[PDB]
Design a protein around this ligand. Structure first.
Ligand SMILES: *[C@@H]1O[C@H](CO)[C@@H](O[C@@H]2O[C@H](CO)[C@@H](O[C@H]3O[C@H](CO[C@H]4O[C@H](CO[C@H]5O[C@H](CO)[C@@H](O)[C@H](O)[C@@H]5O)[C@@H](O)[C@H](O[C@H]5O[C@H](CO)[C@@H](O)[C@H](O)[C@@H]5O)[C@@H]4O)[C@@H](O[C@H]4O[C@H](CO)[C@@H](O)[C@H](O)[C@@H]4O)[C@H](O)[C@@H]3O)[C@H](O)[C@H]2NC(C)=O)[C@H](O)[C@H]1NC(C)=O
Ligand SMILES: *[C@@H]1O[C@H](CO)[C@@H](O[C@@H]2O[C@H](CO)[C@@H](O[C@H]3O[C@H](CO[C@H]4O[C@H](CO[C@H]5O[C@H](CO)[C@@H](O)[C@H](O)[C@@H]5O)[C@@H](O)[C@H](O[C@H]5O[C@H](CO)[C@@H](O)[C@H](O)[C@@H]5O)[C@@H]4O)[C@@H](O[C@H]4O[C@H](CO)[C@@H](O)[C@H](O)[C@@H]4O)[C@H](O)[C@@H]3O)[C@H](O)[C@H]2NC(C)=O)[C@H](O)[C@H]1NC(C)=O
Ligand SMILES: *[C@@H]1O[C@H](CO)[C@@H](O)[C@H](O)[C@H]1NC(C)=O
Ligand SMILES: *[C@@H]1O[C@H](CO)[C@@H](O)[C@H](O)[C@H]1NC(C)=O
Ligand SMILES: *[C@@H]1O[C@H](CO)[C@@H](O)[C@H](O)[C@H]1NC(C)=O
Ligand SMILES: *[C@@H]1O[C@H](CO)[C@@H](O)[C@H](O)[C@H]1NC(C)=O
Lengths: 266, 407, 234, 407, 234, 266
């Protein structure tokens, strides 16, 4: 906790030194904020204070939604997150959208929501093998089920009206990625539905595994269809992705590990 | 005596080196001791001007007096500039005009531009376009002659408050249309062909439409277009190079020679040289002027720079009445100069500070929903107002929400 | 230096035998300058004390009250309007202020968004800063316009501002609001410029007389050839 | 009869619809049956041209004969085009000129451009600039007159082998300098002012320098600049719109009306219409011409398009002698047309195929190290030759290495 | 159609009583056309058979051998040179071929990269080509130039190509190489154009004769005239 | 082996189809090759064939340089290669170097050499714990050592003479990455020197672990120095990398895992 407060104070000391540098140069309100916007190091430190602010909001959101990290998903976020930091960074620069401090702020909103879906997956994965789960865990995770799926429904609705009214822009890849995230909250629901009927009965159910393998087959078919339609569009309009082939190979492998295993079983 | 002046002009026209220019003036400064009436007027304009001889204002005033008693046009002009600017000497506008009139009488061209400009913007005298037509005319004839010989030496226009062939033949064709070369003269249609030549940027065409709007040929003679067409011709003389002598003094760290080589051109009636000669006095870098006569003198040259159509000079005339720079604090007077830069020149900042006087109840009676309009109007006018309105509108709604809770 | 761009000056040449006037601006015998022209001509040009104080112009007016001057403007019903970027203000002097803007539909219809800002069913003249200057005015305040949603269905009010201009043809300098849904209109008219307390104020001119030293004539040898030169050019 | 022709011209000038244009010609086609000598010449140029009436070449030949026996300039002109192009009728250059002369005599302007062009490029007659001066003038007087009235209708220049104010007043000023308007005439200096007006793109100036180089005024009268200045004026008539009538036929799938509406302008002496009328005959899309007279007729219009300065028409004249298109195969003759497009026009491909005839010993004696120069020269001339030289130079070194091993 | 842009034509107006020539080009009595002008003038224009065959021009030449014409060019020592993008070829007729380029150093030195391509210490005239067409030439072939590293220190050789031009001033069309370090030079001269077998070959002109029908004059009512109209600008 | 030949044939069929489509359009050599270079799908299929060719060359080089993959480093290659292709893609697209088919080839050459250094990493890591190793393994791996080190020395020399002569371009980052790969072949040398003096004596050596820790500390210091100089260069010239912060965090962690462990030990 000491190193966390040190990191916050060592970032806020730079922001209070950048702001006090501009206010001495341009002694008013309006030419100061304009000067921060055009200057590169002045907007850089204001970016750093923004990321520390969204870091600490994530840590307090993780603390209220999960009681304690198991230190086995703590690594598992770190590789995925890196995965996610780089491909948003590559999608931001390939599209020639130019560095704007309201679409960078949108991209870390996608990454912040993407990290919370992944944390829900690993928590519901150990909900399979947790024989001692309180009612606080059950309510606090279905709250995470609702709050996410409504949020991606809202941003899909915001994006597919943006792709019609405005035209072809970067708002297409936002709503498509949230549509994949909409399938992602869809996956963890059915997995929570089948594992809630598991705990209420003091006997194993063989059809639960059959429904779980069928459900993973389902959405995996939905996932590759979303990625394949995502391929066919941006070759036609704008330019080659050069990204999003990262989770696609995992999406075919998700389809490979589900369809072929069910074919070998059934 | 006279043999010393020939050596200086030979090295000045032959060598462009800074040391060689100063070495050439060593004989010229020595020739000034012999009272050669041509010798002092080239070192008078270095003793008080700088970037030549070392700057010493008190060393030039007393030897300007003997130039006046001799009756020199170049001495009658500059001694008026001393009393107009209050430079080293107590300020007096009363006989600042008296020296300028005799310089204008004596045949000097600088004393005609300033006397013309004073008659045009109504500074020190009554605004009379008839008198402003006469004095601006004599400069235009004496500069339109030399550009056809010198080729029109163009000089860049640098404003410190912002940082720190095809048409040549159309002039002769339009000249033949009005006069008549093989065809009957038609003043109704020769006006449009002549006026289109000035849009290319050449100032020979700028002269010829001024005479067109003077005598009443073609179009009825209006005062406003009579001298404004004349003025832009006069602002491009051989004294138009004097921004560079002043601007190089600013970049070389000699800030007290960029406030004297700019205050003459501010007196000559510019707007590039009236904001810049006030921006230097804005930050108190000048040292000839006292610390108590630094803001009222910078208010005078911010006031002339605004009436000639500058956006920043109309905002920065609001600031000086907003905080109380050089004047007792007036929120009502500062209010007007902020709106006059909003409706007229559409300056993006000038409606943001309109919101602040609307939001916080300064000058006028407070109204919360009227202030919302001007913050919103600021974001439409510019791309850079999107940020500092958003943190102003969020603060705006916090007061509206907190007041509603208390009710 | 303090607001020095409002003080008028004028050089005159009254000659050798001249007596400075004791009425108007004050004079001194010390603040004289000895002058010399290019053709060696000696002049002694005196200057007045730059005060121009008080208002001792013998202000007398036996004419009509300022109410009576705008009556011929009211009965003729000749009233103007002003354009803006979007809106269009039509003040009608003695009837109403009308603010409206036409919405041109695609081919057939024209839609009007109209509002009503008013309708006609003291030893000191007040002054308002006009571009920072001092102009006394006639206020004509009036209300009962269309209801305003921000003031909880209160009718709008408006004051008519009258300032005089010689070349005016009944136009508007600007339309402005001091508060929400209550607007101020300024009107140019030529009627009030005859009124001494309502005319456009001009500062008195301080006169620079200058006397001709012996050996120099009444006017300098480099001067009279120039005012005739512009007289020919006219 | 005459009442029917008025209805067609009213709907043609009043309606731009394709159906209404065809509906207007229904009375015009019926009026052609009444032998109104004005009626046929507007439908003769549709019966054989297309994009108006349906295309039927044989249906227009016999009614052109009665237009000839009547003595119509518009019938004498086009009947020579049939025998010049061998179009529906056995080819004969002998009396192709006879019909064009009487059309040129009859007052037609097309028969003067073609007769002038034939005298200029030496096609069918001896190249005589004197005779090419006479016929090219008459067109220039009859096109500069209407262009001053019609405003100079500009038409884009479309080449299928590639895909599939300020100066207006300078003309009158330069006209007064040569003639003399208030000044003495000077033909030595009025030439430079007049010639600079043509660089702006206006073609009124193109006319005036042609007469300047014709009579010998200012500059000595040279033949090469006498008619080349004349020719670009003549290539912008009201017949310059005929590319769009031909180019729209190509995009509409009627390829056999883009080879007749282009072969007239090829006969009229263009280079946009001489490559394109050969590119269509290159790919055998035309059907009026036989399958055995498709390449020799496309060799004729590739040969005229090369001598008028086209890069592709000089490479593609190398190909037709390289493979044996329309000629017995000649590696020596094809060699020259490939280097003539290398030294002159610097065509990037034209030194690559120079390497192939150098590397593989075609036409001349083989030399391996000479071929290396032209492949290397190809990469310097263009950015797109970096690739297909690199796979050519790698193949080049493999032969050099394999031969060295066998030794 | 086959190479048809090399056959010259000429229309003549010999009139009513004219007999077609039996020498030169062949004629027929069937290939006549009946003509009509704009002002209704009738003409009968006969045309020849387009053969222009053989070389029966009675080729006789008692003049000098082609060797003797270039001797005055050799002794006068007036020899030219040609520029290129980089190189500079200086053929000297009767001395040498010199190829060199100056390297201008930064201020003081000039470096020369020079090479030597040669030095002066049959009933059918051969024909090369020249821009696609045809031209018989005089070849003058030499060797013993500077050694060539590609040919294992063999001296270069060069043939001098002579073709005639009336307006020539001893310039070069182009310099070219048939193989490495062995170069070909073409030279324009006016001397060989007097030689019947070496002159510039022009095809014989086939004459088109127009017989005037009765009711029409010797030449059309638009001919003569219009011709002389420009005769103004002659 | 059947699927590899199937993939090669299915790529060559598309390449031959594209070449025949171009040759039917422009029936010569030069316009055909120019048309291939200007066309997007034609150059795409040529890119696919080039990638399959470099894949098969990599497979045969791995077969000739390593006897058999342990099937535990194949994954390590798969994640680290995804990392790497995305970093090279993002560095290629931020720099605005434009898509050129002779710098993409250089980037895949860099990625190929990086993959071979990682394979050498894991092979010497098992050579640490391999008690039965033949002389063929020693000779082939030291041949790999040389060849790699000489290659990065040559490319570092080429890139530093490029950055001196031409000016600031992507050759600077090429040379710096090859300098990092030079430090990598340096690490494995010292590790192979120590583990070779380990095997020649039939007794454990305690000083070998100390030398290994000191060498790791060494080169970790060199790596963080190179990454910091790399930073302080490209903030100054051109633009923010937005890449190469990946292996840097692993480079400081390499410094952290070496310096702090040695401090705790010694
Ligand atoms: C080039 O020219 C273009 C046009 O000439 C410029 O384009 C802009 O075009 C938009 C159109 O989308 C204009 O926006 C608005 O237009 C109408 C009209 O709304 C205006 O009037 C509102 C009236 O409210 C006041 O009315 C009285 C005025 O006397 C007051 O007494 C009263 O109390 C009340 O305050 C006004 O409110 C509004 O201004 C702002 O209002 C609020 C707060 O006041 C702000 O938050 C807003 O941002 C707004 O800007 C407008 O000035 C409006 O339609 C109205 O009427 C329809 C009727 O069906 C309703 O359905 C609808 O909901 C709305 O109420 C539009 O919806 C839109 O809001 C805009 O004014 C134009 N801009 C300019 C500068 O003219 C373009 O800018 C020009 N290009 C340049 C300058 O570069
Ligand atoms: C704008 O103008 C510019 C200049 O006007 C153009 O710039 C180019 O500038 C470069 C300079 O770097 C020139 O490149 C070469 O210049 C010299 C000279 O080499 C030329 O001559 C070589 C001679 O070899 C032949 O000589 C005899 C000729 O009669 C033959 O008989 C003999 O057998 C032999 O073949 C010639 O070989 C070379 O051509 C090519 O040679 C080989 C194979 O032949 C190719 O692989 C090469 O690619 C080369 O292009 C040149 O034409 C050269 O210096 C030489 O001499 C110094 C002396 O110290 C040696 O040290 C040095 O090693 C070399 O041997 C240069 O090194 C350089 O190679 C080039 O010619 C210019 N280009 C043109 C078109 O002129 C610029 O292109 C113009 N811009 C345009 C057109 O857009
Ligand atoms: C200027 O005037 C002031 C006040 O009248 C006086 O004190 C001062 O001495 C004067 N200075 C000069 C140089 O005349
Ligand atoms: C004004 O002038 C006086 C000199 O009398 C000087 O002492 C003072 O510092 C100046 N400034 C102010 C603010 O008084
Ligand atoms: C054209 O000439 C050929 C050969 O002389 C002949 O066979 C053919 O019938 C002629 N056609 C016409 C239409 O005259
Ligand atoms: C040429 O014309 C004949 C008609 O006599 C036709 O049969 C033939 O197909 C054409 N083409 C060739 C190549 O002979």
């Amino acid at each position: 906790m000491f190193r966390t407060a040190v990191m916050m104070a060592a970032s806020l000391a730079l922001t209070g030194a950048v702001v006090a540098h501009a206010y001495y140069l341009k002694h008013q309100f309006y030419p100061t904020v304009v000067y921060l916007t055009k200057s590169s190091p002045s907007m850089a430190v204001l970016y750093i204070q923004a990321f520390v602010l969204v870091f600490l909001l994530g840590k307090v959101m993780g603390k209220v939604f999960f009681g304690q990290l198991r230190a086995a998903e703590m690594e598992h976020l770190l590789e995925r997150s890196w995965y996610a930091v780089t491909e948003t960074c590559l999608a931001f620069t390939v599209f020639r959208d130019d560095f704007s401090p309201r679409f960078v702020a949108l991209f870390t909103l996608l990454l912040f929501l993407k990290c919370f879906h992944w944390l829900a997956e690993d928590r519901v994965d150990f909900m399979e093998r947790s024989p001692n789960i309180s009612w606080l865990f059950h309510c606090r995770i279905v709250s995470l089920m609702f709050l996410l799926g409504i949020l991606d429904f809202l941003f899909v609705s915001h994006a597919y009206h943006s792709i019609l009214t405005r035209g072809a822009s970067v708002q297409l890849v936002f709503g498509f990625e949230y549509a994949i995230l909409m399938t992602m909250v869809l996956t963890i629901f059915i997995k929570y539905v089948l594992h809630s009927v598991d705990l209420q009965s003091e006997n194993p159910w063989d059809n639960k595994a059959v429904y779980m393998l069928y459900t993973e087959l389902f959405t995996g078919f939905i996932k590759v269809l979303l990625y394949m339609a995502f391929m066919t569009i941006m070759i036609k309009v704008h330019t080659f992705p050069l990204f999003a082939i990262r989770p696609m190979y995992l999406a075919m492998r998700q389809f490979k590990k589900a369809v072929t295993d069910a074919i070998m079983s059934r | 005596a006279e043999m010393m002046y020939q050596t200086g002009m030979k090295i000045l026209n032959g060598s462009n080196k800074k040391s060689q220019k100063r070495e050439a003036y060593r004989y010229l400064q020595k020739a000034a001791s012999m009272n050669h009436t041509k010798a002092l007027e080239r070192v008078s304009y270095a003793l008080l001007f700088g970037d030549y001889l070392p700057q010493n204002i008190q060393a030039a005033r007393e030897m300007f007096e003997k130039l006046t008693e001799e009756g020199s046009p170049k001495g009658q002009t500059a001694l008026g500039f001393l009393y107009a600017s209050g430079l080293g000497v107590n300020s007096s506008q009363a006989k600042a005009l008296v020296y300028y009139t005799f310089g204008a009488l004596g045949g000097n061209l600088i004393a005609h531009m300033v006397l013309g400009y004073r008659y045009w913007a109504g500074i020190g005298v009554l605004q009379s376009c008839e008198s402003a037509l006469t004095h601006y005319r004599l400069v235009a004839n004496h500069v339109a002659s030399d550009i056809s010989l010198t080729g029109g030496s163009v000089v860049q226009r640098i404003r410190l408050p912002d940082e720190v062939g095809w048409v040549d033949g159309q002039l002769q064709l339009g000249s033949m249309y009005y006069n008549g070369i093989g065809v009957k003269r038609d003043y109704k249609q020769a006006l449009k062909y002549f006026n289109l030549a000035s849009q290319g940027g050449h100032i020979l065409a700028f002269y010829n439409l001024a005479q067109m709007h003077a005598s009443g040929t073609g179009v009825m003679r209006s005062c406003h277009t009579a001298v404004e067409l004349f003025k832009n011709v006069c602002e491009r003389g051989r004294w138009s190079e004097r921004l560079m002598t002043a601007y190089n003094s600013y970049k070389d760290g000699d800030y007290n020679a960029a406030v004297i080589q700019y205050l003459l051109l501010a007196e000559q009636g510019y707007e590039v040289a009236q904001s810049n000669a006030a921006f230097i006095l804005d930050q108190r870098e000048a040292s000839i002027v006292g610390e108590n006569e630094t803001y009222p003198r910078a208010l005078l040259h911010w006031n002339r720079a605004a009436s000639q159509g500058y956006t920043v000079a109309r905002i920065k005339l609001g600031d000086y009445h907003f905080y109380g720079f050089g004047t007792d604090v007036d929120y009502e007077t500062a209010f007007i100069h902020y709106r006059l830069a909003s409706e007229q020149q559409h300056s993006a900042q000038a409606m943001f500070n309109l919101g602040y006087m609307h939001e916080k109840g300064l000058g006028i009676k407070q109204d919360i929903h009227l202030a919302k309009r001007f913050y919103d109007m600021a974001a439409e006018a510019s791309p850079d107002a999107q940020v500092p309105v958003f943190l102003a509108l969020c603060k705006l709604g916090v007061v509206y929400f907190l007041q509603y809770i208390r009710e | 230096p303090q607001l020095s761009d409002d003080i008028p000056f004028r050089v005159n040449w009254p000659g050798t035998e001249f007596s400075l006037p004791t009425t108007g601006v004050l004079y001194k015998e010390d603040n004289y300058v000895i002058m010399t022209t290019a053709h060696k001509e000696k002049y002694k040009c005196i200057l007045p004390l730059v005060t121009s104080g008080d208002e001792e112009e013998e202000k007398d007016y036996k004419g009509p009250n300022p109410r009576e001057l705008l009556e011929p403007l009211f009965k003729q019903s000749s009233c103007s309007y002003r354009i803006e970027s979007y809106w269009t203000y039509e003040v009608c002097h003695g009837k109403h202020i009308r603010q409206y803007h036409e919405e041109k539909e695609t081919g057939q219809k024209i839609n009007i968004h109209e509002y009503y800002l008013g309708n006609m069913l003291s030893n000191e003249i007040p002054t308002k800063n006009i571009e920072g200057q001092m102009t006394p005015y006639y206020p004509v305040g009036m209300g009962n316009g269309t209801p305003c949603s921000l003031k909880q269905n209160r009718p709008r009010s408006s004051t008519v501002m009258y300032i005089c201009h010689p070349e005016s043809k009944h136009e508007i300098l600007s339309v402005a609001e001091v508060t929400t849904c209550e607007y101020e209109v300024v009107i140019l008219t030529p009627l009030l410029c005859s009124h001494p307390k309502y005319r456009f104020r001009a500062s008195p001119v301080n006169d620079i007389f200058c006397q001709s030293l012996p050996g120099s004539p009444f006017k300098p040898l480099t001067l009279r050839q120039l005012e005739q030169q512009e007289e020919i050019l006219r």
